[PDB]
Amino acid sequence: DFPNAPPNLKDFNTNLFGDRWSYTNG
Amino acid sequence: TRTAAHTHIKGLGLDESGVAKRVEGGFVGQIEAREACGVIVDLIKAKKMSGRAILLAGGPSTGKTALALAISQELGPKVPFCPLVGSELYSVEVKKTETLMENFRRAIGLRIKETKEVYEGEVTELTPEDAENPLGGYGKTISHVIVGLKSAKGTKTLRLDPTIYESIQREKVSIGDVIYIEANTGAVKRVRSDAYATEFDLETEEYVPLPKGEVHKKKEIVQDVTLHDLDVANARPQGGQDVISMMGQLLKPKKTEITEKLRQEVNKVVAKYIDQGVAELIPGVLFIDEVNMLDIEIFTYLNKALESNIAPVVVLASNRGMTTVRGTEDVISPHGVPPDLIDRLLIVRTLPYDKDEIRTIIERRATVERLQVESSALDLLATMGTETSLRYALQLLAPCGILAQTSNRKEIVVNDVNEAKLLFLDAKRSTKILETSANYL
Amino acid sequence: TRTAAHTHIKGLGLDESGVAKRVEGGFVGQIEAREACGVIVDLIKAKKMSGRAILLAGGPSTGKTALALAISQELGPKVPFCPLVGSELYSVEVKKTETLMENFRRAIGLRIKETKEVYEGEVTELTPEVIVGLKSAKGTKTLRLDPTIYESIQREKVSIGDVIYIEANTGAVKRVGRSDAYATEFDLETEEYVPLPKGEVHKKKEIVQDVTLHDLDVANARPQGGQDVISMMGQLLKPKKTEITEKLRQEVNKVVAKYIDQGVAELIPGVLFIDEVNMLDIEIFTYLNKALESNIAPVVVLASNRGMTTVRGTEDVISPHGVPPDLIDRLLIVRTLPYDKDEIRTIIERRATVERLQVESSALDLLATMGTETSLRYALQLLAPCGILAQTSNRKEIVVNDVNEAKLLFLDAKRSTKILETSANY
Amino acid sequence: LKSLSLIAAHSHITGLGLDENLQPRPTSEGMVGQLQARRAAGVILKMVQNGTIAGRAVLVAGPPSTGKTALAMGVSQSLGKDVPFTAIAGSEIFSLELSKTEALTQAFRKSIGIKIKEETELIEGEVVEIQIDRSITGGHKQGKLTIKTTDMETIYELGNKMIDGLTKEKVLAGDVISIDKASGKITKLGRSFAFVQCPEGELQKRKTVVHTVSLHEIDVINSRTQGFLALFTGDTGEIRSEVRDQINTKVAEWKEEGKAEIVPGVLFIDEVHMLDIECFSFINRALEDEFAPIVMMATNRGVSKTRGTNYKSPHGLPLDLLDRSIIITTKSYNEQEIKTILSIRAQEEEVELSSDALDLLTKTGVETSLRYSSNLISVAQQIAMKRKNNTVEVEDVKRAYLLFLDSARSVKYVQENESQYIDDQGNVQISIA
Amino acid sequence: IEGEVVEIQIDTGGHKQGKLTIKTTDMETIYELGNKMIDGLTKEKVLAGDVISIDKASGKITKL
Ligand SMILES: Nc1ncnc2c1ncn2[C@@H]1O[C@H](COP(=O)(O)OP(=O)(O)O)[C@@H](O)[C@H]1O
Ligand SMILES: Nc1ncnc2c1ncn2[C@@H]1O[C@H](COP(=O)(O)OP(=O)(O)O)[C@@H](O)[C@H]1O
Ligand SMILES: Nc1ncnc2c1ncn2[C@@H]1O[C@H](COP(=O)(O)OP(=O)(O)O)[C@@H](O)[C@H]1O
Ligand SMILES: [Mg+2]
């Protein structure tokens, strides 16, 4: 099971910009 | 541009086949001593012997220290060169023997030179590569990681072992800011960038420009360390919140007599490393002037120390005749050095000067001090040097120049040197004043 | 085996009447000195006097150090015996008098009895307050523990299934190791396994451990705590020894007196031996003079080989054996006499037979004549080179040729001085 | 293997150079002449190697530049490694943080070794497979590996610390690995592929390792909790006597039972003529201990004043210490012996000499000291090399002789130019006119 | 940078809306904020009415 994409790549994407930056990206 | 009793000495003024020119490298006269020091310099550059000792002797103001400084200059800044006065060995914290051994080891140097392969640049993109699992399984399997790097004039994408993933995870690499990776050892180092520096309103993250040239880089790094640095680093601790660090910070760690075991371990590891061709050994020079101030115990320990197999070359300066060695009252020796140590080293004589040599010395020193003097005062200065002393004439130059500048002149004349004679005295006239006065003078 | 200038001396060799036999216990001659030493030994065994001070005076190579060692060996391992040289009193971090008093306290001993409570076994649970569910091979019990011992437990990285060993008196904690029950958890598991301890979890033992007064004085003078980090850093804060106030000594004396009064301990005074007292200076002599007139001081024996010489630290104060007259007045002097030819021969024979060597009669007589002509110690020391020279020729018995070659190879003091005087370059 | 070294003063000697029956050859192993002293040194070496006699002091006396230091170096070289040999100077005892007796005790104890043997198991091979399972936000991990040899091939599953031990040093499928079960220590012998042959034989093996340590180190370790650091920083002060008293008995029981074996060594004291009378008395008392090594002292003084006193004694030592010592004397050198010494010294420094130059060097080492010509050899070679001919001739030797002065010539120059230099009363004349 | 009389404006998720005003006698302007900037700001809290200083050297914001 993979809840959202490759989970390792998922956390990589999260640390690309940050949690708040991820929220405000859209 | 500040001058102090030196800096007009640039080498020994030697020549191929080891013959010293009469006037070269700020040197005049002293041909034999310069030739001997050149032979010593060649022996140093051979880097084969160990613990060779020479003592250069002569009267005061005869260029005894200038010779050692000249050989240090000729040897080059690469080789270590440790200067020392004989009175520095008496330390309150540690015994004189350990201080002597520390200064003895500080003269030996080690050059570490090695190459590194680097991929450094700005991240273009990064992506795992899904592939079939090697074993039976139901899930994504990453067999490679593709990372693209762009720098000035260069761009390249690379496929890498996926296990390095944690290196990105720990490094908080992000995308497009920076990257700098080593080739073989793996791992990644995060060195933001000027491309997005002005994009944000304000940010507490530093920015570096695009790396220059091809992403792939060959770098050769060379450094030099004295063995004393290795010993003191091995003995002294390091770290953060450990109890030993707190103890060291709270104790003012004065010097301690480093044990022989640590020195032997350092020697063994250094020998192993130079066996691999990554390191090179460079014996240096230990210069000690005014050795007459050394105690007999230090001389006795020097006798044993000179016979070690990692000893540097020690040069000694002294200006004493038949004198009693310090620490004793019945041994009278030449140069204040015990005969047993004298038997272990090579003597280098040093002769006084002639009036013409003194005149040339004064002219050169005046030229190096940005002053203009004609012969009508240069002859008087030479006569003063021959009458009072050479060093007195050397010192009198600057007051003469200041007096000339006061009178809105440019050239030093006889009147200026006479006025400087009247104002400042030498030792002989001071003693004559002292003897003829009976007012506690 | 290993021999070093001794170990052929096994006691004073006295009988019940105290009369010294001519040859007994690795001793020949020295009858009067041996009898006096035996009297002093009996006086020490009486455990009544305090501060008695004797010195034995004689020329070099007469057995003073041998006599002191024989006294110590005859007294027995139970009684403490502190040997010292005059040069040890010049320390670096403390004054000389403090070091002398430290040795004085070290000289006497105290034998005490104590009860030690011990827990051990496998650990079933570990819940913070700490509660430990110990379980032995027969019994199970839960214990409540202090935060410090809990910290020591944590630093031991203990877990469920680890047989451990706690001591109640000191709080010392040691993890014995993983229990044998979980012996199948990893095919290459590095951890060692131990069977569960036998008996109940709580045990009590009675021990008769000895101590010295200086030991329990330095116990509260400066600690050596153990596994606690706070104690470690406290003992690391001060790394140098210091002078002890007399108040600590008085409190120690009161505690020890209470202990011995309670019928739990007994006191055994010891001996303090000082070889080469001539190295002491006037200040140490005065302080020792003052400290001898105390109520706890042990028996002190001194050794010296001097004539009428000047006391160190003074300019013109001359005295016999280099000892101030005031300290001499409160001293008991034991004379020591030189030896004769037959005594030297017998000593050489004893030293040969202890070193498992065979010496023929002619070689022994030559060695005795040499010893009379040069010195006794030189003849004693020349035995081993003779043995090796005999061995090199594939032999076992020392021959006249061997001692002659040893004479040729090695020189004594007289010939060395003769060759020193008649030479140009030093 | 060979440690860091250069061409030292005594680098040309390796052992005493004796026969099977302690007969010294005229020239062997870098030692020339002095047959009596060499045979005595061989006898002392046999005494040390037997390991039964303890606390023997032997004194080597002779004029300067005679061979006593060379004799001690040869004894140390012939004794080989694994036998302690602590060489110190007479002035090293004085210290600002340790008393003279304490430093002497440390020097004495530094030259007795203790060797403890222990048996270790190993599993060595080439990694065939490794599977590792990390539970994210989980506290436990699941490991397994498959390891083979040329004959065996077996799988194992690992606990907790095995996984981290394997992960700190990256272990891959192309590696050769050795594992110690007791310690769990990783050892990488090389990557087979992807320059070392595949490990052969059984998958597991047993071996023995010896830990050798000086008695002084054991003494230092148990003194204080931090005393271990003093093994390197050298900051330990006045270890209490009871520590040594207990450690001696503990070593005795260890030797008696059979866990460890002790090896006595040699303590060499150079320039022993300078030492306080306190140190001499302490040595007199401490020579009698059972745990005492053979002490070799070197001296070159005649009837001189002993430090710390006001009377003169032979060799600078008191008669008390001289009484319990054995003296070996060294004699001056023949001209042929001097020539041979110069020849071997020149051969050591890979310097080619001409016969006439060698004869002139022998003559100048006969008139002056031998060390003068021995030093002159290298500078003569340097001059010859600068002249571009790789052979030392008489001209280069004479150039070096005139360029670098001798003690006698320097003394004569000072005596005839007394006014130039600073005398003992501080009066100098710097002005030429 | 000095004169941080701000009256901050921070309300997505994880403390979004990273903006704050800056006023002085002759200047007045609104600055947007980054993740690290607000992470620094939350420590050493600014009451939004206190003159505060901050450097552009990517260092630490100093209370005045
Ligand atoms: N040949 C020379 N060339 C240049 N300067 C010299 C020469 N000889 C002596 N000097 C001068 O003499 C001074 C050195 O004095 P020195 O002889 O070293 O004193 P000491 O011998 O007491 O150490 C220097 O300031 C240097 O300028
Ligand atoms: N009665 C004796 N029997 C055997 N050996 C003796 C006797 N007396 C002295 N010795 C030996 O003489 C040596 C010197 O003795 P010691 O007391 O250590 O020094 P000193 O006698 O000079 O004070 C010792 O090694 C000891 O073995
Ligand atoms: N028998 C020998 N064989 C080789 N070299 C010797 C011999 N004797 C003396 N030397 C040399 O003479 C020099 C002086 O050393 P030595 O005489 O041992 O010390 P010291 O001068 O303190 O007596 C040493 O460099 C040594 O190489
Ligand atoms: Mg100078």
Ligand SMILES: [Mg+2]
């Ligand atoms: Mg004695």
Ligand SMILES: [Mg+2]
């Ligand atoms: Mg020597």
